[PDB]
Each structure stands twice: as C-alpha cells, then as structure tokens.
C-alpha cells in the first residue's frame, strides 16, 4: 500500500514537468516536457523507467497530460517512435486540439535552427494515440484504475486530474489558477480526501488581486512608456495568452485612447480568435454568457502593425511571438527595440526559460547572445505576474478543499518551495515534501478493506446505537471473491454446523430449618427482590426462573440438614447464571 512519486523533470526545477506516480500496482506519468533555454540535454527529461523495461507499454499503464504548454505537453511527440510508447494518452478535449498547434510551431522554430527532432510525421503518429476525457467524467483506463478531470482554469483545457485505484487517490493539480482570470473562473476540486496532493509551487509568495492589480500595473507602465514614443515588446507563448494581451490593449485604449496605434500577436491571430470562439463550454461561465449576447475578440490590426513596426521608432503596441526561444519573431522584435529610449519591454509570463530567464532576472545591460552578437539594451525592464497561476494563498485554499493526508511540491524553485512547504506544514496538520529531480517519496499509506454486511445485522446494530456500549459481533466469510459479514447464527447455518448447547446445572446446598415445601417460593421472592428489572417467574410446576436461568428444588437429600436447589443455564447465560449461584451460596433470608 505504498504510492511512489518521483518527478523526473518536475520537483525543484520549473518546466519539463514530468511526474511518475505508482499508486498500488499502477504506474502513471503526469506530464512529459521540453525544458527551454538549452540547445540540448533537456529536449526530454531523461527516462530512468524507460531504461529498465524496453517497451514503455508494459511498465506504464497510462499517461495524463495537463494542457498545451510546451512545458507540460511539449515533449509528448518525443514518445512516438524513439522510446516507442503505446497506450491511452489522456488530455481534455480543448487541450488535444491546441496541443499539435504548439507542437508543430516549435517544430518549425527548431528546424530553422542539425537536430534529430520529431518530424510532423511522428508528432501526428503520437497524436493518433490520444483519448479525450470530458470535464468531471470518470473513465476507467484499466479494470481497476480510473481518472477524472476537473476545472483548473489557467487556460482553456487546463484539466486537474485525480488518478484513483481503490480508495487512495493521487490528485495532480498543475498550472491551476484560483482566481477568475479572463476566459477562466476559479478552479474547483470537490472534497475527495485524496492521500497525496501534488501542486504547482510557481508562486510561493502571496499576491494581490489577480485582475485589478494586473490592470493597475499595466496602465501605469503603459503611461510611463507613452511619454516619448513608448514601445511595447511583450512575449506571449500561448493562444489564450495572445487573447489576454489583446484584452489588456483594449483596456488601455478604453482608459486613455490618446494614441490610435495597436498591434496584435502574429499573422495567424485569426486562428486564436477561432479556437476561443469554438470552446464556449469550457470558458468562464459569465464570459460564455456575455459571448452568447455580445461580440468576442475583434482584431484586424496585426497586418497594419507589421509594416508600421518594421524597425521604425514609433508607439506600436507589439506583443511578439515566442520571446524566450533561441530564435523567432520575438527575438527579431527585441533586436529592433534594443538600445532606444522609446523601448519598454514587459515580461508577462514567469519569464523562466533557462538562460533567457537568468538574463531577465539580473537584467544586465551587457547581455551576450548564444551566437557571436553584441547587443546592449537601454530600455526599461519591468516584470508583472499577469500570467494565470495560483499565489501561495491560492495553494493553501485548494489544499484546504482537498484536505489530503499529505502534499508534494513540484514545479517551483527550491527556495520558494521550501518556505511554502514550511508554511503548509505549520498551517494544516499534514507532512509535505519538496523533492528534487529523480528523487522518489515512498509515502506509506495502508489498505482500506471493503466488505459487505447483512442488512438485518446492520439494522439491528444501528438500533442499538441510538439508545445509550455498542459492541457488535459476528463472523466474516472469506472466499477472496465475496467478503461478507454475517451474523453468528447465520454463519453457523451457512456452513451447516448443527445446533450445539453447553448446559450447566449447579447444585446449591441450603442449610436452614425451613420446610422443603417452601424452598421455591423463598427463592422466587428473594431473587425477585434483589434482581431489579429482571424477568423473574414462579412457574405452575413450582420452578423459578431468572431470565433464562432455571431454578428447581431437588428431591430430598440423605442429609436431613441440607436442601438442594438446582440452578441451570446455558453458556450464553453464564454470567447471570454464575452470579445467581454465588449469590445463593450465601443462603436465603431466614
């Protein structure tokens, strides 16, 4: 009953989120990623489990992928041919549609950079081995194990997955945002009481309101730029991130409107527009309602921008394509904006992509490119956490709703995670981990054994319950097929054992001068007096009873000084029976 969780790519490292999870006899990989900012050694987080069993199918029962980000699902096509995985890859329906879109686009950027990358051929091969799982739909992947999606917010298609095989549930919750950001309300998980909860720890510091704070910051930054031809250079790595940026630009225009100039994500913003409109069910409840009654996500400005913003020194609001990549449209845009006063650049996401991330962190003016290029920047660098994610307050809340036996921290940096771990340990009465890459936690649980009762038995015991001490007896029948709990008598009847009786008769010797004729009457009257609230009877044949204990005056003994009282009971009445005989040994009133 031990569930072993070892993050091969997640854990202390952010991106390449991969977490193997061995609930009972079942292994389930939780993601498989393309850590960015490295030319090699991070295309796929190295696979210990792969090196052990030649075919992955045998070792691994199942694979759930969280959503479309290159972080999580990026290296999902690695697995088409080279390490040769077959089985149900389970993503939500919005995920699987957008997943190939980002796979192929990265595929494009990689080949212009030779590299033994997955072609579109093998990406498509991998995608053909995919099953779509609707929201809150319980699907048995195996005879025993099953997996249920939840709403994770963050992006359209962010699925929080609970793998449960038996009564022990490991619920991964990766990239979940606990606020109603645009396109997404707050992520709800019901009260599962899972044994292990696995969480994103990207933000281990508590943040302000997700929407209001990010609006204030954005507006301030824009105004500050605007003084002298204020440029915008913003990286956006997702389809639904582009939409967010567009909405922010709309807000800017609404508040200000001084400069007409607006730019869009890229040439194929048509597509993003399309996809968002398509998946009305998944979007934030309110937003969907607003869409059914109002126009959504108008954009016709990208084309106008491109030509205008071709290395010219104006105000154009360009959210470029893949910012934190080796090359791209975004790199070109950054090179264009580099070294001018006009320029202000915003890091909207987490801006953690290996080397580019490090450069962002320290914001060195003398930055060195991978190639032999000298670029010196003199723009203003500001980062805002506009990226959809849960703050350390949010992590606390979801831990609350799940209320697990234990938690495991993945997908944050160790320092941040450490503090968060300490907090959670102090706050809720659980022990939480923060394991590194390639390190397993053998968190012991114990088996919880399901057996069926006889309804009669259950009813009777329930009745005993309510009037007040509640001890309950009876046997189990164990074929290893149909564990049942049945009554004493019922079990006896089932196995066909005959009705046994262990009877005692004890001879009580009375020594007094009262006449033999009066014995039974004396016994009856004394025991009726003493044994309060007991059924005590004097029967028509002269014997006396105390509940089911039988008392009978014996025939005259050959000792004139002695009168024998026979006291008899079965083993079931042994306590009362021996009590009565110890009582009577003191003799009767005289």
């Amino acid at each position: 009953p031990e569930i072993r969780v070892t993050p091969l790519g997640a854990g202390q490292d952010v991106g390449r989120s991969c977490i193997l999870v061995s609930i009972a006899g079942k292994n389930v990989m939780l993601d498989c990623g393309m850590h960015m900012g490295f030319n090699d050694d991070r295309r796929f987080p190295d696979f210990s489990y792969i090196t052990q069993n030649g075919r992955l199918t045998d070792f691994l029962d199942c694979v759930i992928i969280s959503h479309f980000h290159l972080d999580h699902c990026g290296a999902l096509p690695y697995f088409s041919e080279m390490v040769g995985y077959d089985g149900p890859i389970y993503m939500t329906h919005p995920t699987q549609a957008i997943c190939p879109i980002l796979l192929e686009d990265y595929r494009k950027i990689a080949v212009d950079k030779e590299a033994n990358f997955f072609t579109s051929q093998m990406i498509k091969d991998c995608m053909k081995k995919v099953v779509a799982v609707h929201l809150h739909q319980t699907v048995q992947v195996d005879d025993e194990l099953e997996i249920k999606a939840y709403y994770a917010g963050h992006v359209l298609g962010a699925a929080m997955f609970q793998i449960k095989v038996g009564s022990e549930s490991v619920v991964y919750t990766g990239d979940y945002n606990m606020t109603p950001d645009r396109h997404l309300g707050a992520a709800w998980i019901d009260k599962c009481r899972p044994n292990l909860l696995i969480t994103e720890s990207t933000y281990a510091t508590t943040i302000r309101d997700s929407k209001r704070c990010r609006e204030r910051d954005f507006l301030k930054k824009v105004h500050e730029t605007v003084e002298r031809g204020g440029k915008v250079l913003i990286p956006v790595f997702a389809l639904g991130r582009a939409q967010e940026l567009c909405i922010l630009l709309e807000t800017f225009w609404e508040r200000m409107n001084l400069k007409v100039p607006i730019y869009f994500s890229t040439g194929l913003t048509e597509k993003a527009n399309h996809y968002y409109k398509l998946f009305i069910p998944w979007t934030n409840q309110k937003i969907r309602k607003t869409f059914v009654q109002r126009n959504m996500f108008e954009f016709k400005h990208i084309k106008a921008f491109d030509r205008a913003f071709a290395d010219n020194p104006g105000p154009m609001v360009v959210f470029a394509t893949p910012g934190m990549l080796h090359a791209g449209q975004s790199l070109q845009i950054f090179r264009k904006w580099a070294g001018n006063e006009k320029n202000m650049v915003i890091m909207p996401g987490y801006c953690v992509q290996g080397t580019v991330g490090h450069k962002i962190l320290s914001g060195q003016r003398k930055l060195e490119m991978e190639g032999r290029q000298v670029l010196e920047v003199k723009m203003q660098v500001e980062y805002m956490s506009f990226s959809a994610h849960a703050d350390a307050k949010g992590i606390m809340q979801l831990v609350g709703q799940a209320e697990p036996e234990s938690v495991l921290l993945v997908h944050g940096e160790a320092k941040k995670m450490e503090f968060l771990k300490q907090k959670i340990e102090q706050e809720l009465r659980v022990n939480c981990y923060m394991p590194a890459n390639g390190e397993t936690v053998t968190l012991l649980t114990s088996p919880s054994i399901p057996v069926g009762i006889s309804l009669g038995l259950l009813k009777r015991e329930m009745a005993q319950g309510l009037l007040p001490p509640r001890l309950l007896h009876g046997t189990l029948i164990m074929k290893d097929s149909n564990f049942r709990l049945v009554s004493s008598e019922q079990a006896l009847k089932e196995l066909g054992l005959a009705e046994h009786q262990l009877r005692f008769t004890c001879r009580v010797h009375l020594h007094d001068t009262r006449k033999e004729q009066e014995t039974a009457l004396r016994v009856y009257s004394h025991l009726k007096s003493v044994l309060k609230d007991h059924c005590v009877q004097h029967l028509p044949d002269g014997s006396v009873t105390v509940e089911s204990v039988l008392l009978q005056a014996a025939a005259p003994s050959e000792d004139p000084g002695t009168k024998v009282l026979l006291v008899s009971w079965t083993y079931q009445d042994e306590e009362l029976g021996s009590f009565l005989t110890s009582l009577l040994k003191k003799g009767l009133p005289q």
Binding site: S167, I453, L472, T475, L476, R484, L497, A498, T581
Partner: protein, 603 residues
C-alpha cells in the same frame, strides 16, 4: 422498491422511484394534447374565431364557452396543458428530480413554483439551455395574446357525458392549468445543477446517479441509479443512431437489475430516412409550382436535421432564390447553440420579416400544436390557396387534430413525421444484450398499437409489468447485503483473524463499533455461539492430563456420561449437547467449561 407512475403518456413519463431510502422523480413532463383540444388563439384577431357559432349543448347550463368548427367542439378558453398528477405521492418526499431530454423537461417550473418541493434537479448542460429557450418560446406564445380571461367551464363530469366525442376522451379534465409565468421558468432553471455525462453525482451518500449518453438529440441523457448492489436504469429519449450526438451507451446500461424504458417511437412505422426524402421532394414540388410551403416545427432536434437535407436538395435541384424564412423568437438562440455545439431567421413577425417578405418561400413557424404561436396566423393566410402546402414533420401531435378546427382548408396537406427514437425492433435487440431482470414500461408498449393488429409490441422474456396513470407498482427486490468498509490503523489487524473450516471458506470473529457518518459505515475496535462434538476418548484423556482421577464413562441412550467421581461431577455428552452437572464450586465449573470449550468451534 416502489415506482410511482405519475404521467400517462409514453413520450413524457414523470415516474418517481422510491429506493434505498431516497426517492427520485425520473422526469418532469408537460403533455400538450389538452392544448390541442382548445380552440386556436391568433396573434391578430382572426375573422373566423369572432364569427364562430356555439355547438348548442343546451340542457340548461355554457353556450358561451363551447364552440363548433366543422362539427367538432372546441373550447373558447386559453389552451390548458395537462400535467402529471401530483396527489399520489407528495413532491417533498421525492427528494431530487432527474431530467432526461430538453423536450421531456417541460413542466419542471409548474411543480417547483406551485406545489412545495425543496430538492436539486440534475440535468446535463445542453438540455438545460435548450429547454430554457423552449419554455420561453412557449410562454411568449400564450402571453402574446391575453385571451386567458375566459374560463373553460366544461370540466364537470355531467357536462362531459352529454358533449360529443372530441372532448369526451380527456383522461383528466380537472388538473388542467393555464401556463406558468417567466418567473417560475427562471426558478426552475436556477435549481438545475448542470452535470456532465458519465459524472458520478451521489445524493446524500446513499445512491449514485449518473447521466449516460442516449444517442438522441443534444442533451439526451438516460440515467443509471445504482447502490453497489442494485442497478436501476432509466431509458428515455434514447435513439440509437442520430448522427452527430454521442451514441447510445448500451455497455454502461448493461447488467442492470431493473430497467425502466419509457421513451420510444411515437410512430412504430417511422421509416425515418424515407420520410426525410419524401419531405424534401414535396417541398420542392410545391415551390416549383409557385405555391408556398409551411412547416410547423420546434426550435431544436428535428429542425436542424431537416435543414441539412433541404440545403443538399437545393444544391442537387438548383432550387435557389426560395427564401427559407425561419420565424420564431428564439431562432437567434437556436442557431447560436448549433454554432456552440441560405436560411434567414427573424425573431419578430411583422418586422424584418414584413419588409423582406417574398412571394414564394418555406416558413418554419412557432408551434406544431397549431393553437399557440405564429403558425396559426400563417396557416390562416395560406389556408385559402390550394397551391400552398403544410408539412407536419412533428410526431407529438396527431395529423388530424390540427386539421380538425381548420378542416375547410384549401392547402394540400402532407404528413412527414420523423422520429429518431429507438424502434420496437431496436428496443428488442437492445434488451436481449443489456439483459435486465425486470423491466417496467407503460401499457401502451405492452399491447399492440390501436391502429395496427400486427404484433410489433414490446416483449421481454420476464413478461414486464405495465405502468399506468395513478398506479403505484412494487417490483420484487428486497435489499439483502450492503457495504461497510473496515478501519486501517485499529480494526484491520483484530479483524484479520481467520480460522479455516473449508479450503475456500474462512471465518473471523469481528468485534468493533460502528460510526454511521453521513450514511456510510465504518467498524473500528473501541458470548459466542458454539458448534461441534465432544470426542469422549480425547475428552477423558484431556481430563486425565489436568489431574482428574477416578473417571468412568458409561454408554447412555444417544450419548455417554463422564463421571468424575473424585469431583462429584457428571458430564452428559450428546449430539450438539454437553451438560455439566456439579456442586456449587465455581472454580470447578470454570475449569470443566474451559476443557469442554477447547473441543468446540466458536462463532
């Protein structure tokens, strides 16, 4: 289990399942044949209605409130809808309501706002919205014209006996009510919690209900109610093959203790595909001759299937420039849902429509009942022209009732009813495999249909109980065994004490105490019955080992007596009977009891 059947019609059932101490109203349905019974109500005053005569019922009493059209009586009150009887079982005690299809969920707001009920309706997301815009459509039509001032005044038994055939056959007369307001609609939709497919929504930690896919139009959700022992499955609007909607989950409906099947073909000789084809031919023919076409349909399901075929025929026939004008308030919404999951739709008649109206066209109108809606008015305009046709695509309402008030109509009348719902052959093949032990289904299915002599009727091996109105029918299931989990840290250990009797059977004495938390059972630790025989030889040897001297054994009828002479003791050893007789020496008794007990099994 007692299932109470609260509605007569096979199509809309409203059947209430009392089970495992929790009761469920399996559907809430509004019948609407009562509405076809009343005289049609137009948006703008129609000459005919004003100039109509009475039927001369006489016999004192009413000449005001009963009219005559083509020798058939109608009533000069607002169409009143029959609703499922509320009296046989209190609504309060029916806990949650499950609702299957958007068409079958009307009358939800009647009950929720009228007769007291405090539970949570569970219905899958599509159906809720479709049903919402359908009731809004219904409310709009009856409230477009305020002619509800009048009273029917014909409900009396006496009045019914004398009056003619069309009215005579009302199964209930007294339960008819005027339509609910938009507030009640809102309350109803509010109480619905939107639950996706295959979602295991459990009520009060008792039973687990889950909406399976049915195969029929979007939102069609047959339900399974299981309790870990008995699986009861409810099978309404469960068309096998209807293209786009996710298909019927036969496998998920398999091995069900008790199957309730209620939704089934309104027309057994449906021949769906053929009728679609004929439909489109007829439409084409009439638009070619230059006469107009009128189609009375609903705002979902059949409408979209017929639209896709029409487009294809136009592509194939090159019959363009014939405006396909869909006229209904929620047309806007209807198309929106199609998008979410050359036809021009106009929410308002006498508006965009009036400005854009062209001389030939195909108009898909307000209501199939022909009583309340926009159909009425167009019917009147085109009635007087032989050229113009009307096609009834809808099975809900019989061909002949609509024809009845408007009997002197020039329009060529065509019937093209299409029902995608399982056929009787389909239901027969379904039920062989699903293999359920008892099935409950209305009388209608039990007997062959009135129209046709032929033996198409629904039959199962178990000879299934027929439902009926106001019929509380108890099927033959008692609960025999219920689950109870065992504790981890304290209990498992003590309750893992098996003693082997047989190769494949073991027995463990379990003692614990039970906490009944939120209707779930958990036993955790806070005189046995005896069985067996005493082998006399081995018993005496045991006695000797413990020091007892002077033991004698004698044969008796049906056993032996062991005489412990040194201890003034007798032990009578018989089949299933040991009798220890001694003096009042508790230590001696206890020692002998212990020695005897070693030879017996404890249960």
């Amino acid at each position: 289990m007692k299932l109470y059947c609260l509605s007569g019609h096979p199509t809309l059932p409203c059947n209430v399942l009392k089970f495992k101490s929790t009761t469920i109203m399996l559907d809430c349905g509004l019948d609407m044949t009562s509405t076809l019974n009343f005289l049609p109500l137009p948006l703008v005053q129609s000459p005919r209605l004003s100039n109509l005569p009475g039927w001369s019922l006489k016999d004192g009493n009413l000449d005001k409130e009963l009219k005559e059209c083509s020798g058939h009586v109608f009533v000069d009150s607002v169409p009143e809808f029959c609703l499922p009887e509320t009296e046989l079982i209190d609504l309060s005690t029916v806990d949650v309501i499950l609702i299957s299809n958007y068409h079958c969920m009307m009358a939800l707001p009647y009950i929720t706002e009228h007769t007291g009920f405090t539970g949570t309706v569970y219905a899958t997301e599509p159906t809720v919205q479709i049903g919402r815009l359908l009731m809004e459509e219904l409310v709009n039509f009856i409230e477009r014209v305020p002619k509800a001032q009048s009273a029917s005044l014909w409900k009396n038994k006496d009045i019914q006996r004398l009056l003619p055939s069309p009215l005579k056959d009302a199964v209930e007369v007294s339960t008819w009510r005027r339509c609910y307001t938009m507030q009640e609609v809102n309350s109803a939709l509010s109480k619905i919690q939107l639950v996706g497919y295959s979602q295991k929504i459990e009520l009060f930690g008792a039973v687990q209900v889950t909406p399976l896919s049915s195969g029929y139009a979007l939102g069609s959700s047959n339900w399974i109610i299981q309790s870990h022992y008995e699986k009861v499955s409810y099978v309404s609007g469960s068309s096998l093959l209807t293209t786009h909607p996710q298909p019927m989950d036969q496998a998920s409906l398999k091995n069900s203790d008790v199957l309730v099947l209620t939704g089934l073909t309104q027309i057994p000789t449906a021949n769906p595909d053929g009728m679609v084809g004929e439909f489109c031919s007829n439409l084409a023919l009439t638009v070619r001759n230059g006469g107009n076409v009128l189609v009375p349909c609903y705002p979902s399901g059949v409408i979209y299937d017929l639209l896709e075929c029409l487009y294809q025929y136009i592509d194939s026939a090159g019959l363009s420039s014939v405006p396909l004008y869909f006229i209904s308030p929620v047309a806007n919404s209807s198309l929106e849902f199609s998008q979410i999951f050359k036809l021009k739709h106009y929410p308002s008649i006498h508006g965009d429509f009036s400005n854009d109206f062209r001389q030939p066209c195909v108009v898909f109108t307000g209501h199939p009942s022909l009583r309340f809606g926009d159909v009425v008015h167009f019917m009147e305009l085109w009635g007087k022209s032989s050229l113009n046709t009307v096609i009834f695509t809808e099975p809900d309402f019989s061909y002949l009732e609509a024809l009845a008030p408007y009997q002197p109509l020039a329009m060529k009348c065509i019937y093209c009813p299409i029902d995608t719902r399982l056929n009787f052959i389909q239901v027969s093949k379904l039920l062989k495999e699903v293999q359920p032990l008892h099935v409950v289904c209305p009388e209608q299915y039990t007997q062959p249909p009135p129209a046709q002599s032929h033996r198409m009727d629904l039959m199962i091996d178990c000879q299934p109980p027929a439902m009926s109105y106001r019929r509380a029918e108890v099927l033959a299931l008692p609960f025999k065994r219920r689950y109870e989990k065992i504790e981890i840290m304290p209990e498992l250990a003590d309750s893992l004490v098996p003693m082997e009797i047989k190769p494949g059977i073991s027995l463990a004495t379990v003692s614990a105490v039970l906490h009944t938390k939120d209707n779930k059972h958990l036993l955790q630790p806070p005189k046995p019955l005896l069985s067996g025989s005493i082998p006399v030889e081995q018993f005496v040897q045991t006695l000797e080992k413990h020091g007892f001297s002077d033991i004698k054994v004698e044969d008796t009828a049906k056993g032996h007596i062991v005489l412990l002479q040194e201890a003034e003791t007798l032990i009578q050893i018989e089949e299933d009977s040991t009798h220890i007789i001694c003096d009042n020496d508790e230590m001696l008794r206890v020692r002998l009891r212990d020695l005897v007990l070693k030879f017996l099994q404890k249960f």
